[PDB]
Design a protein around this ligand. Sequence first.
Ligand SMILES: O=P(O)(O)O[C@H]1[C@H](OP(=O)(O)O)[C@@H](OP(=O)(O)O)[C@H](OP(=O)(O)O)[C@@H](OP(=O)(O)O)[C@H]1OP(=O)(O)O
Lengths: 230, 53, 45, 114, 32, 604
Amino acid sequence: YNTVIDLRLITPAMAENFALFLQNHYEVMESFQVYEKTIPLFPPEIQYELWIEYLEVATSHQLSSLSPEHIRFLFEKALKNLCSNGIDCKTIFIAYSVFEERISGLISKSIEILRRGAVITHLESRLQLWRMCISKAESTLGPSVTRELYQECIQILPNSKAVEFVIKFSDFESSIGETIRAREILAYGAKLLPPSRNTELWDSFEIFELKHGDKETYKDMLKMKKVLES
Amino acid sequence: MPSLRDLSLERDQELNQLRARINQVCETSDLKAKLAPIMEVLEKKTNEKIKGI
Amino acid sequence: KIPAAVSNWKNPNGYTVALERRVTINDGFMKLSEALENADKKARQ
Amino acid sequence: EKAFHYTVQEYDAWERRHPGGISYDQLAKLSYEKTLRNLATQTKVQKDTKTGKITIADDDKLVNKLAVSLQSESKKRYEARKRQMQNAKTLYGVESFINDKNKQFNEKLSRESK
Amino acid sequence: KLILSAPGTKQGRIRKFLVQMFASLPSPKNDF
Amino acid sequence: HVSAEQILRDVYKKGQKTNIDILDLEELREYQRRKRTEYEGYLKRNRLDMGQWIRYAQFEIEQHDMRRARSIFERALLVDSSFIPLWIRYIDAELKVKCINHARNLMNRAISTLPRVDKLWYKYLIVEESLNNVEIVRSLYTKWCSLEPGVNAWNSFVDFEIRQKNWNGVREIYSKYVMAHPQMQTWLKWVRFENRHGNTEFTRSVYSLAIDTVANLQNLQIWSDMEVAKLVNSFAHWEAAQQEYERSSALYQIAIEKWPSNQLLKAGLLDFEKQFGDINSIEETISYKRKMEYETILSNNAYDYDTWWLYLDLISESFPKQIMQTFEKAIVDSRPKELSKNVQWKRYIYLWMRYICYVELELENSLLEEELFQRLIDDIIPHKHFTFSKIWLMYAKFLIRHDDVPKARKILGKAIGLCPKAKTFKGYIELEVKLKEFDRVRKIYEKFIEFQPSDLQIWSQYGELEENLGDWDRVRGIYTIALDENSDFLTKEAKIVLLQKYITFETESQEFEKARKLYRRYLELNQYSPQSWIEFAMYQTSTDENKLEARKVFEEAIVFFKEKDDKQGRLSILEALKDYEETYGTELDQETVKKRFPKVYIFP
Ligand SMILES: O=P(O)(O)O[C@H]1[C@H](OP(=O)(O)O)[C@@H](OP(=O)(O)O)[C@H](OP(=O)(O)O)[C@@H](OP(=O)(O)O)[C@H]1OP(=O)(O)O
């Protein structure tokens, strides 16, 4: 195998075949040397697959002796190199967040890593990273961080994409008890799109006003709807 | 995994055919979690001293 | 990039341009007005 | 899954076979390079004593080709601008105008809103 | 620009008596 | 409908509204005279109209009178010799009529007049190259480059010699180009050339020139560190490709020795060693690289306390001699500017707590730790605005650890004084309970209830406190004070809850009569609610004497309902009587309740 690699006849499937041969023979620490010897040779589009294999083996394998600062060094190297070439790096960002939760338990660092992924064109992936980053912040980090993530996600994403997060922000504020902030968040969200193509916010606006508003505010919502339709 | 390890596992399975011929809420929750064992150790040292008193 | 000048007084070539191209709060006032309302009520009563 | 089986050598081959505003110096170099590309598609001295001027033994065929290349590129540029002017003279949506120069002025004003 | 009200906005001498009452308490027996 | 837009379209259409031939020389002369008079008139009135000058020259070109056209161009150059389009038009006019020597004389004048205008040099170059005058093009580039032009001219000269396949010429040009333009991209352009168009002996010699140059000229600081780093990395990777890993290793060692201040060079050695080196030397370099990365992230953003925690882990894991210093930086760098318990202060205080815990565990330096507590409490935390309860409780635990318990109580009283806090009081209470000085805990509780008098949470604690102490009389007095009129700051529901707790406590002590008195008081507090009457009946039932007491309580409930003159109260009393009959009575009392039931109410 080493002579194939030296001759530059190694193919991505064979570079993984060698690494899996070594891992099956408990020579895991030398498996990583295969990945590092081969990743630089291929274009970034294939470096993505080999990086996924390398990091998945490094983070979860009983024989790997990589210290946590080494595994972080690998992760940061992967994200810097691949994002320097525009390759979708969603899986590496998710794996990095999971590893950061595992090794140290710093949820705040895990969320910030996901936010780095969502803020950096693969719009569906950035919507998945915004949903995971925000849900994790809601579940573990509370308002002081959740608000700074929501008001960035809404600000960055275009219309008809940020509306999903306007409804989610309003629901978060309604649960946290700031009903007025939720009402004005939904008021901001209603203006983003014509109600003909914006029903998703409008039925949740009706739900919110029935749950937390009253007759005079609900009538104001209806005024808003008919004014917006014109 | 799905891209290259999935193919290579098939390769290591196809080699069995060759082997046959071979043989034939808190905003600081996370820091609290990290720092908890040290707090517990310090609390036990306090308990021992306060029991001495 | 210096914008092209469009004058609101002069039009040497007789051009036609879009209308867009051709075309204070102090509490003392409220305080005064309410003082005069109070004085009016004082006298009226 | 078909791309996982190319050697490193094949990736080197494939990656080498298929890898606002401009300053006048940069535009000049680019125009020079374009003219050299065009040339690639197409392709002694003596000094007198009495007058002192030097003469160069040029190829009259190359001098003809040069004059023709300059005439044809001027012609091509002129016709391209002529078509662009007809397009400008027929497009609509710009603010009301009363003559052609007023139309060109309103279009210029519209380009500032970019 | 998405302008929000600040976080926390919502929709829409007894110390002497406490001290006197505490001082009126009976003495403790410490029977434990 | 009429519109202003429609009106103006009609104006536009309203306003938007002969080909003579020349048959002989006389008519041509008339025409040319008229045209020349026109053009000369305009140029006389406004000589600065360069466009008109060019159009007049072109008109003479169309008359085939090159002498007149030349004169017009010359006169225009007299007006403005800086207008590049005029020069270019004149040169093109000369070339179009095949007057190559006039065009040459003119292009030489142009570059002599405006040598810094690249367009004129490129015009001369492309003209001579079109005529296959390779040696003239070469002499032109030699002069241009001798005038020290920008990198574009040098790149073009290299491209020219590459077209000529004159590899020695390209070496000589690069030999001059690195002097004219010392930037490291120029040296890397030369090595990039020698790799594809030259032997390896030359490639090594050019890399050696590059390093010897940056070494000798280092004292001028011409190159930035990133440039030298790219030069060294490129040279090392090139020697690694040539299988001479030993010479790349020597290169990295000697270069790092020469320029220790370049972090990018150390990182390049890490990148090289991770794929061509060994396991042992990789992790120490990775630790240093991560130290630098955390340092960069922290200097860019000092309030990133997640990275502070990781940075402290890295330094105490790999560089034990730098632990204390980096702590003294974390304290002073990350301290917040604000004056509120926002997330930054809450996360900052844990760096201080980690510093304290580390000192206590790994050094046992009680003097230093006491100095740290003094610095924190007295200086850093803005007590007048807020305080962290955990800090003072930790100070108390440490102080008790070192036998200064009176000083621990002193600092706790001080903590109460400067900033009362619910958690501070709770922790003080907890610690004093563990101290088993129970008599002091109640004096703590009075300060607590002074701090915030409305919460029943504090009010309920004296119950099980004095119950643990066994003082029944003190507990009863405290309970009576809790529900007394002096506690009007508590809500009505809270007062009822406290009364219920006191009633349960009295029932625990088998004081049935006092329990009944308190139940009557609570019914008075409940404004004689029917639920209060039901609770009184249940309490009587808990006091066959229970059944008789329940019957008496039912009679009392009926009397109270009648006194309130409420039919709903009477119905509630009847339901209570029926429930007592069902629970501890018989069907006879249920029938009596049916008789007392009012018709749809009208009591009978
Ligand atoms: O005012 P309290 O009712 O006593 O609340 C305190 C206090 O919260 P605040 O400072 O926001 O008032 C503590 O914060 P610190 O004083 O220590 O800064 C907080 O601790 P955390 O900062 O860790 O959240 C603690 O909660 P906990 O007891 O879980 O430590 C909580 O005490 P209570 O929950 O008993 O009210």
